[PDB]
From a paper:
Multiple strategies have been developed to modify monoclonal antibodies, including chemical conjugation and protein engineering. Owing to the location of the binding site within the Fab, we have termed the peptide a meditope (medi-, middle, + -tope, place). Based on our observations, the peptide–Fab interaction does not affect antigen binding. Herein, multiple crystal structures of meditope peptide derivatives incorporating natural and unnatural amino acids bound to the cetuximab Fab domain are presented.
We substituted this side chain with the amide of glutamine in an effort to recapitulate the lost hydrogen-bonding interactions. We confirmed that hydrophobic interactions are preferred at positions 3, 5 and 10 of the meditope. Adding polar or charged side chains at those positions resulted in diminished binding, despite the presence of additional hydrogen bonds to the Fab framework.
Author numbering:
A (entry chain E): 1 to 12
B (entry chain B): 1 to 220
C (entry chain A): 1 to 213
Amino acid sequence: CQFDLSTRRQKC
Amino acid sequence: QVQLKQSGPGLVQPSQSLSITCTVSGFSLTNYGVHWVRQSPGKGLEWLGVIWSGGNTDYNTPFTSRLSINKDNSKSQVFFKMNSLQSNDTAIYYCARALTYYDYEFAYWGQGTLVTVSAASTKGPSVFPLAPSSKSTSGGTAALGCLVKDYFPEPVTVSWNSGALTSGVHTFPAVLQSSGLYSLSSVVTVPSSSLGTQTYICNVNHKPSNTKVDKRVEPK
Amino acid sequence: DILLTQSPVILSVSPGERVSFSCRASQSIGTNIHWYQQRTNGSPRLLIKYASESISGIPSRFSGSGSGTDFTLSINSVESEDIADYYCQQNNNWPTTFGAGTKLELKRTVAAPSVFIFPPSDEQLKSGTASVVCLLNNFYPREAKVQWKVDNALQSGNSQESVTEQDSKDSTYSLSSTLTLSKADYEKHKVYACEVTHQGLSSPVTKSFNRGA
Ligand SMILES: *[C@@H]1O[C@H](CO)[C@@H](O)[C@H](O)[C@H]1NC(C)=O
């Protein structure tokens, strides 16, 4: 997973 | 209440410098240290450094060469500055305060500042209505929205009826178009009987371009 | 620097269940570990300090244990508002370092999407571009297919999807599929259809309009 700048959530 | 409010998000050109202002209240900069932490896709949460009560600074090792932290106690402001940014310095930057004056357990955070490192230009969005109709009204519920199109960089904030309307709102994550500009939609579901009496406005704000637009969305 | 390894990468549980997060350190760090929650579009919120010590304003259902290298954040009865990422932080050794986070997803019953379709506004058409939006609202689970058709021609490669994070109240997702055409192409066609396939639908649901009426 990587941190997503758009949502401030982890994106897997 | 204890609060930290950061300056707005924006673009910085590659090899240029980043400046963020953190403004605090509910405590004194003479009693507490203020820390800076960033969050990026490549490296996650990184502690960057700190300015202590008495003015001393510590910088995380890979940042000592390009990081300066200063403050004005009287104005309750902390000033963050980082030199020669590159792409992977694109991140959310936060200021933060610990529970106790000497510690590192971060109980209070700023709202974050999204910094995009890019050679491109700032561009404000166009806002287009996603109008409700019968092809968007089932069982008494109507869907309506706003298309916020062709802006750069992120972020854009969207609200409905100046904050009064939040229930049933969905603001979608932005997507990068082939043009290298972002686009998103924000929708909301409402009782279709209310379309004749209530006004629906999406309030769009693109701080990096200082573009504020209120779009009224009516049934067509 | 201390390497913190968080496992697993994603957790998925049903509401009411207990759940535990693991944070492992590369060398002993006593109990110098803090835990944070990050919700969609939020800043980190401090949950636990020094492995097990409580934080004011944090619900009692959150706790932590561990010492040395192996640490555990626990939620004794998960609620939908707990949908978030969770991070550990060590401060036994300068500089303070964080783990890479664990994602917490919530299970729930299957919910079919409500589908709405929106033609391009005449406003947008003045700029020479046409966006056609298809909304799939409040469904579960996340997997869905959107198929676009213009005058019965399959559209491929000219649409983009965005999906929300899980809703903190009802645990559903919503999805937007946007189809983008030049104004010229848009005017050369009549029937615009969005077809939606989802586990909660017995048949694909199609929403469509004719350019005009
Ligand atoms: C940015 O790139 C440098 C090398 O140019 C690397 O050392 C550093 O870890 C990178 N930072 C990231 C990916 O956040």
